[PDB]
Amino acid sequence: KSLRDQLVESIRNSIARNVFFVDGGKTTFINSVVKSLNVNIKCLPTIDPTKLPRHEPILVTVTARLNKMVSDKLKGYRKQKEQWQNHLAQLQRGLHLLTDKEYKPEYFSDALKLSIGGQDLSEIFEELVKRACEILDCKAILITFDDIDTQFDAGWDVLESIRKFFNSRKLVVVATGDLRLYSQLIRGKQYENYSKTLLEQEKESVRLAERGYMVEHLEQQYLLKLFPVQKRIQLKTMLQLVGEKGKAGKEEIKVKTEPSMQDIDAIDVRQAIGDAVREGLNLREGSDADMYVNELLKQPVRLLMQVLQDFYTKKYHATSSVPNLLRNALYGSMLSNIYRAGLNYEQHRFGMDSLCKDIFTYVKQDRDFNTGFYLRPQSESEA
Amino acid sequence: MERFLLNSTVLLYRLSTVSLDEVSLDERVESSVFLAQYEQARSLPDHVAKSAWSYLVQQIKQRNMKLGPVAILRLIAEKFIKNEKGGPKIDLPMFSEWQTLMSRVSCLPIIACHQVFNPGPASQEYSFRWPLYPYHPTVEDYITRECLHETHQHLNGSTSAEECWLDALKHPEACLRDFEKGWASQEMKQLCAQIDPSLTPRIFKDRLQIACNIREILCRVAQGVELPEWIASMQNPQQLANSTILHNGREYGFATVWPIDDKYSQE
């Protein structure tokens, strides 16, 4: 909202690397941002890297969307068309470079045809964007890429698409995700550059150490260039968007709890959470319950929205126990969390027998051993 | 006979007089066709006409189209035009009656209908070129080796009449001026009465500007642009007899944007 607006302003005063990034929901925010831009810059349909066959280059995908946009802006109302197919064919012909698992020599004389020397696909792409903005009468093109949480590996590829092809001043990148995975993947295939025999032989702490230093420094430096900090976006969180304990509350959220909910029955968001917990927790309205719900307002918006949408849903269903309607919701919310916790899974074996053993397991895993039975969500792990 | 469905003063008058919301105009259209064939080709023996009309309505119903230029243009297209060699070509056995029909109608509509509904291989980007020709390798060879030899071309200004249509639409006021200046002459009065009894320059201009409006509105729909609101108030064809339309107190001029600079080009 406000965040997307500042971001819009930031990219706008950028045409005057060239890659804004959004930490982190994420997709909703990015879609809203793109709607915002609809100082002439033309946007691209959002790029979902995880939603692409294992064999495409980000560049081919970009070329496809660009093809559509150019062609239809062209069928709207020539020689510009005629000029475009030349670049298109040049791209097709030089396209092999990326795919080819081996160099075929015939590509040599191919490279011998005719402004840097060779068949630079990146320069070809730059004339491509030149033609595109020349024809669309736009200052630049936005390339909008989705997070790669579902496939953090394909993202690397977009990174090289950027580095090798998007070092142009009429293109701007909008990346989204967690830079931690970026770091890992870039590191992972940094390590892949070494020679297998090398590490196979030098398996000693000393040399392990300095190569780790080298790889980590290179990862850091390369992330610096690819994602220069200035244009990165931190984004405001839901609890950051909500009063910590009531001494805040820029832009009250308010949520719907009943089907009627004629915009005046909205029971805040913090207050709805507190009711759900206290009554499902039989928790009183004291300080710990508050902080309990603060350690709830962290959770990712999807998880919290599901867990608080199945809460009142089933309460209304039963009303035409709060703790069990809420317990069933927590079960779905943390199931794989609880599943990897190694704790009771079957629902037909609830009892109070399994509860004591499971509490023992939780306290041992949280270490503690002093107030673990308090079951405070104070652990470092979100699991 | 379909020529009658595309050239009929009776049908034109009747349609233009009736609103856009009658529906089920079959019988009146049929009667108009009977009349028009009577005046144009009176010599037909009074039963062949009904035979043919029944035949056509037959094909229309079995093929599940409605009585309209879409259907008629379709029928004409399959009957006459084909894809061969280069671009659509007219059948050798049928060229003569092709000319008979052309004497009455314009080719471009059929040409478009055929291109849309039975285009050749999607390889030869078709550029509209009038008129239509049959194919013979022998005649083609003779032409290529010796070319044609034009001597007598003084009929209509010096161009084909079809262009005079778009020329009038681009200079509608000039068309009215020239028509009037000549309408006072007895000859042209006789000819106008002979062709359309109740023409007069007033309904002349009305028809021209109405056609302009039709082209405009159907431009909007063809480009699929939002079907402007005033189409709802657009209820009687005569409403196209004015350069602007009154929906509710507010006047709309019909003009829109066109892909090409020359909105009046045959292309």
Give the method of determination.
cryo-EM
The three-state secondary structure class of A43 is: strand
DSSP characters over chain B? -HHHHHS-HHHHHHHHHS-S-----HHHHHHHHHHHHHHHTTTS-SSHHHHHHHHHHHHHHHHT--SSHHHHHHHHHHHHEEE-SSSEEE-GGGHHHHHHHHTTS-HHHHHHHHHHHS---TTS-PPP-SS-----HHHHHHHHHH--------SSTTS-HHHHHHHHHHSHHHHHHHHHHHHSSHHHHHHHHHH-TT-HHHHHHHHHHHHHHHHHHHHHHHTT----GGGTT--SGGGGGSSEEESSS-EEE-----SSS-TTS--
* Minimum Cα–Cα distance from B263: chain A residue: A77
Tell me the backbone φ, ψ of residue A42, rounded to 5 degrees: -105, 135
Distances (CA, A) of A259 to A32, A268, A314, A321: 27, 15, 12, 20
DSSP-assigned states of every residue in A269-317: THHHHHHHHHHHHT--SSHHHHHHHHHHHTS-HHHHHHHTHHHHHHHHH
- What is the DSSP secondary structure assignment for residue A370, as one 8-state letter? S
Buried b / exposed e over A239-273, threshold 16 CB at 10 Å, is bebbeeeeeeeeeeebbebeeeeeeeebbbbbebb
Is the distance from CB of A233 to CB of A5 less than 8 angstroms? Answer: no
Q: How far is CA B102 from CA A297, A371, B26, B92, in A?
A: 78, 99, 26, 16
Contacts of B259 in chain A (CB under 8 A): 76-77
- Which chain A residue has its CA at the smallest distance from B261's CA? A77
d(CA B62, CA B107): 26
Check residue A367 and give left, alpha or beta (phi > 0: left; psi -120 to 50: alpha). Answer: left
Nearest CA in chain A to B258: A77
Compute how many other C-beta atoms are within 10 angstroms of the C-beta atom of residue B150: 6
Q: What are phi and psi of A367, to 5 degrees?
A: 60, -100
Distance from CA of B122 to the nearest CA of A (A): 17
Structure tokens at B238: 């005569």
8 A C-beta contact, residue B7 and residue B77? no
Residue type, B224: G
* First CA to last CA distance, chain B: 28
- Distance, in Å, from the CA atom of A131 to the CA atom of A86, rounded to the nearest integer, reads 11
Nearest CA in chain B to A76: B259
For residue A265 the two structure tokens come to 């029955």
The answer to whether A278 and A289 have CB atoms below 8 angstroms apart is yes
Q: Which of A125, A189, A120, A123 minimizes the C-alpha distance to A153?
A: A189
Q: Would you call A344 exposed, middle or buried from its count of C-beta atoms within 10 A (0-12, 13-18, 19+)?
A: middle
Q: Which of A144, A142, A115, A138 is nearest to A127 (CA)?
A: A115
Phi-psi category of residue A204: left, alpha or beta, with phi > 0 → left and psi -120 to 50 → alpha: beta
* Strand, coil or helix: A363: helix
Instruction: List CB contacts (< 8 A) between A81 and chain B.
Output: none
Residue A57, preceding peptide bond in cis (omega within 30° of 0)? no
Nearest CA in chain A to B257: A77
Strand runs labelled E in chain A: 19-22, 41-43, 140-144, 171-176, 232-233
Nearest CA in chain B to A77: B259
Q: Which residues in B lie closer than 8 A to residue A76 (C-beta atoms)?
A: 259
Q: Are A76 and B260 within 8 A, CB to CB?
A: no
Length of chain A: 383
In chain A, which residues touch B (CB < 8 A)?
Answer: 76-77
**Are B208 and B169 in contact, with CB atoms under 8 Å apart?**
yes
Q: Quick check: helix, strand or coil at residue A69?
A: helix
| Nearest chain B Cα distance for residue A142, angstroms | 27
In angstroms, the CA B259 to CA A281 distance is 67
Give chain B positions within 8 Å (CB) of A85: none
How close is the nearest chain A Cα to the Cα of B225, in Å?
12
The encoded tokens of residue A37 equal: 């831009």
Specify the 3-state DSSP secondary structure of A205.
helix
In 3D space, the residue among B199, B131, B210, B134 whose CA is nearest the CA of residue B169 turns out to be B210
Residues A346, A372: Cα–Cα separation, whole Å: 24
Sign of the Cα pseudo-torsion (A348, A351, A357, A361, in order) = positive
Q: Rg of chain A over CA atoms, in angstroms?
A: 27
Question: Which chain B residue's Cα is nearest to A78?
Answer: B260
Q: Which residues of A touch B260 (CB under 8 A)?
A: 77
Q: Is B188 exposed, middle or buried (0-12, 13-18, 19+ CB in 10 A)?
A: middle
Number of CB pairs < 8 Å for A and B?
3
Quoted resolution (Å): 6.7
Reported as half-sphere exposure (CB side, CA atoms, 13 A), residue B257 has a value of 6
Contact B260 A77 (CB under 8 A): yes
Q: How far apart are CA A186 and CA A126, in angstroms?
A: 25
Minimal Cα–Cα distance from A79 to chain B, Å? 14
**If contacts are CB pairs under 8 Å, which of residues 223-262 in chain B contact chain A?**
259-260
Q: State how far residue A76 is from chain B, nearest Cα, in angstroms.
A: 6
Interface test with B, best of A74, A75, A77 (most B CBs within 10 A): A77
* Residues of chain B with C-beta less than 8 angstroms from the C-beta of A77: 259-260
Amino acid at A313: T
φ, ψ for residue B253 (rounded to 5)?
Answer: -70, 150
Residue of B nearest to A74 (CA): B259
* Max Cα-Cα span within chain B: 66
Joined together, the tokens standing for residue A375 give: 């079951």
The torsion angles phi and psi of A175, rounded to 5 degrees, stand at -95, 155
Q: What is the rounded distance in angstroms from the CA atom of residue B67 to the CA atom of residue B77? A: 16
C-alpha span between A84 and A114 (Å, rounded): 17
Q: Is B224 left (phi over 0), alpha (psi -120 to 50) or beta?
A: left
Structural tokens at position A334: 């943390």
Q: Which residues contact A315 (CB under 8 A, 6 or more apart)?
A: A322, A325
